[PDB]
Design an enzyme around this catalytic site. Structure first.
Site, PDB file in Angstrom:
ATOM      1  N   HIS A  88      -8.016  -6.618  -6.001  1.00 29.71           N
ATOM      2  CA  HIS A  88      -7.286  -7.615  -6.754  1.00 29.71           C
ATOM      3  C   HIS A  88      -7.462  -7.303  -8.219  1.00 29.71           C
ATOM      4  O   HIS A  88      -8.199  -6.427  -8.588  1.00 29.71           O
ATOM      5  CB  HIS A  88      -7.755  -9.030  -6.380  1.00 29.71           C
TER       6      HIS A  88
ATOM      7  N   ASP B  65      -2.948  -7.868 -13.275  1.00 28.18           N
ATOM      8  CA  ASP B  65      -1.710  -8.201 -12.579  1.00 28.18           C
ATOM      9  C   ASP B  65      -0.515  -8.253 -13.534  1.00 28.18           C
ATOM     10  O   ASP B  65       0.573  -7.748 -13.212  1.00 28.18           O
ATOM     11  CB  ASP B  65      -1.880  -9.526 -11.826  1.00 28.18           C
TER      12      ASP B  65
ATOM     13  N   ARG C  98       0.878  -1.158   0.000  1.00 24.14           N
ATOM     14  CA  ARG C  98       0.000   0.000   0.000  1.00 24.14           C
ATOM     15  C   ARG C  98       0.917   1.208   0.000  1.00 24.14           C
ATOM     16  O   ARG C  98       1.994   1.151   0.553  1.00 24.14           O
ATOM     17  CB  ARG C  98      -1.070   0.211   1.087  1.00 24.14           C
TER      18      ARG C  98
END
Lengths: 354, 354
Positions: free
Chosen positions: B121, B151, B80
């Site tokens: 995600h 991703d 983060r």
């Protein structure tokens, strides 16, 4: 030209799809890209270029091409292997005028092998390496994930990586080399996580029954009251918890998150919950949470989403929106892409390049 | 260590998904990657690394980490935004000990803005920018294209481009900088061709009704007699023609290729044709021509496909296959990846780093 590749010189020989995407991102990041086409584009893809024309089959065009190439750091071609060879623009001819050149070959099947001469498209390349088989629901036939995996994720993006890598290499050997970028290989490495997971039982060859393919009730989309969708990505237990809490579902009355046998049950309870209100209601519920619940926006709604607004992920051009450059650099930032302009003269560019 | 990134030094702060995939590709191309984990992995993803251990919350591990970073070209972090900062490893701290560092931040939402502290995600990032809406059939809710698009295709592969681009910029500035690689931005550029096509009427927001999403009968999978699939990518007229010939269909009996109004008819006739024989029958008919028809292989079949064998796209490991390095370099080639071996003591790496 703003960006970290300010100064880099790229010749692009006009072809379709992955090659021009790679050329685009180089321009996006400040490179000086000069695309040679056949004798104003409204294709945003051709942003951040100068376009010139030549007949690569005429002595004159051949010669002009070779002089551009002689002043360039990178060449991008996406033809059938043997095409540049036969034009006199093959790697060996280029090397004779510029051995610092990064010669980048974008194909599906690669430079050699039984399919190397055969036609194909993204769907074919991902059909042959297990990727397309692993997409979609177990009760439907494999759906193409557009051309995002072959053409781009495992095509242009690998060309880019090879080009920039070979540039780093050149910084210490003083020489360039050829990059053989085949979508069938790039996409395989793109999906390496799955090949890894196969060997530890964390992924199976059965369609639509894995954690990331729609097999898991907490990693899927759900249809809401208005016929629109939310995406649930709530893999960690604490994310799952947050998602049940927003839904007002009591964990005690549900199957456990990872009791696969009861995943039909879990999915049905999640379905009935999400279907009870409209998409945009769930954006309010889950506001500021780790529930990993997002609205599924159609392209035409994207530019109104606040996080997309606040970060300037898109810019306005033509019809509408195009993505700003990615990724972002703290010190040498990219600027807003320049449109495709009119054609220009090739001798002009030489003279600019000297 | 073989490949064009021989010599490059990378510290990877252990995390999930995109960041380790970026570290992998650098290692695959010759980099010297050192992954710091918390106090032998069987995760083929952690190939081409050395793993060290430290507690970054502790004075001693922070100082050891800082000494490593001091010697590195590239730092990767995937936490983060704000996490390295509070740990003492933020970009400004690293700059104090090494202003040539390429500090590379792999997030979904990016470093700033309304969602930048929220969990998420792959599925979530591509839900927000139109990509996930565009996947799948018109009569089914949006299906995740695994985590290939956020991703990896628009995640790790942009981190990579950013890293290597920044290394190029560093050759003349003599400084590094921070790369802010957000999956929501990278995936958008990954799909830029669709955003281009929207503005010219070549793409619609209507699901399941485009050239590349399975709306077209010549760009889709079909079920065969044995319940297995082929992929048809036959866009060009001459490709389409070859495909109809292999099926033994007379063009004159069919609707025109691009009469969209009769696409239900065209699909039904193609459906019936392909259903008359088993996948491997069509795989043989179509083995050489430009018909753009390929068998859809499952992962467990891939390693037996002639084109895959001949080019060594995969290598054996841990009782399964893994993809070899991509792309390929004609002069400084990559070797077969090195397995994740046991831990190593962190002082030993510092030592080795002269």
């Amino acid at each position: 030209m703003a960006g970290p590749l300010s100064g880099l010189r790229v010749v692009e020989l006009a072809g379709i799809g992955p090659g021009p995407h790679a050329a685009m991102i180089l321009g996006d990041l400040g490179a000086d890209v000069v695309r040679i086409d056949r004798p104003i584009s409204r294709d945003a893809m051709l942003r951040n270029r100068r376009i010139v024309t030549a007949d690569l089959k005429s002595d004159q065009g051949l010669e002009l091409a070779l002089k551009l190439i002689a002043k360039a750091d990178v060449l991008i071609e996406g033809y059938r292997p043997g095409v540049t060879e036969r034009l006199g623009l093959g790697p060996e001819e280029c090397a004779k005028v510029n051995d610092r050149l990064i010669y980048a070959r974008m194909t599906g099947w690669g430079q050699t092998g039984p399919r190397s001469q055969q036609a194909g498209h993204d769907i074919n390349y991902i059909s042959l390496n297990g990727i397309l088989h692993a997409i979609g629901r177990g009760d439907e036939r494999p759906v193409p994930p557009l051309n995002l995996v072959g053409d781009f994720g495992g095509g242009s993006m690998f060309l880019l990586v090879g080009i920039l890598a070979a540039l780093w290499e050149r910084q210490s050997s003083g020489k360039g080399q050829v990059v053989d970028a085949a979508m069938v290989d790039g996409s395989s490495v793109l999906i390496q996580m799955m090949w890894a997971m196969r060997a530890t039982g964390m992924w199976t060859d059965t369609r639509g029954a894995n954690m990331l393919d729609g097999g898991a009730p907490y990693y899927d989309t759900y249809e809401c009251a208005d016929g629109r969708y939310v995406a649930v990505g709530a893999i960690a237990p604490q994310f799952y918890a947050a998602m049940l809490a927003g839904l007002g579902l009591d964990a005690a009355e549900l199957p456990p998150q990872n009791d696969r046998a009861r995943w039909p049950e879990l999915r049905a309870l999640l379905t009935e919950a999400f279907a009870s209100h409209d998409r945009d209601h769930w954006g309010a519920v889950f506001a500021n949470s780790d529930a990993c619940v997002t609205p599924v926006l159609a392209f035409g709604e994207v530019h109104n989403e606040p996080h997309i607004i606040e970060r300037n992920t898109f810019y306005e051009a033509n019809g509408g929106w195009q993505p700003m450059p990615a990724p972002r650099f703290s010190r040498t930032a990219s600027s807003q892409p320049r449109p495709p302009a009119a054609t220009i003269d090739i001798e002009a560019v030489l003279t600019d390049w000297d």
